[PDB]
């Protein structure tokens, strides 16, 4: 193939349009949503406050206090696995973390 060495697959990239659709239903200003919008989302997700804060702590890898469609998709993926009866590692492995926040010099 092209690389072989680096053949990484972002798990969220396979079910991103769904969390993306949910992202648009929260009214995204300048392409992001504020804490309020993702808050009400996590509010009715029926997850504990602690988990919600932890998911946010993983989602905003960009650290801009706002959630882009990338970051919200990450959050929704964590919430989805929660709903599916799983736990989120509370950590950002190389297959959870969006390459959009990897700046190399």
């Amino acid at each position: 193939g092209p690389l072989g060495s680096d053949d990484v697959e972002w798990v969220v990239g396979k079910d991103k349009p769904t969390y993306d659709e949910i992202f648009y239903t929260l009214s995204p200003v300048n392409g992001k949503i504020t804490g309020a919008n993702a808050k009400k989302e996590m509010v009715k997700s029926k997850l504990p406050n602690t988990v919600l804060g932890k998911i946010w702590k993983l989602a905003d890898v960009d650290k801009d206090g706002l959630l882009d469609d990338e970051e919200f998709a990450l959050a929704n993926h964590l919430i989805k696995v929660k709903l599916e009866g799983h736990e989120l590692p509370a950590d950002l492995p190389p297959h959870l973390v969006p390459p959009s926040k990897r700046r190399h010099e």
Binding site: A36, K39, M42, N49, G53, W56, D60
Partner: peptide, 12 residues
């Protein structure tokens, strides 16, 4: 130890 919490779910 307090730090600038930027998490709107906890605030503190």
């Amino acid at each position: 130890f307090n730090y600038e919490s930027t998490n709107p779910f906890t605030a503190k």
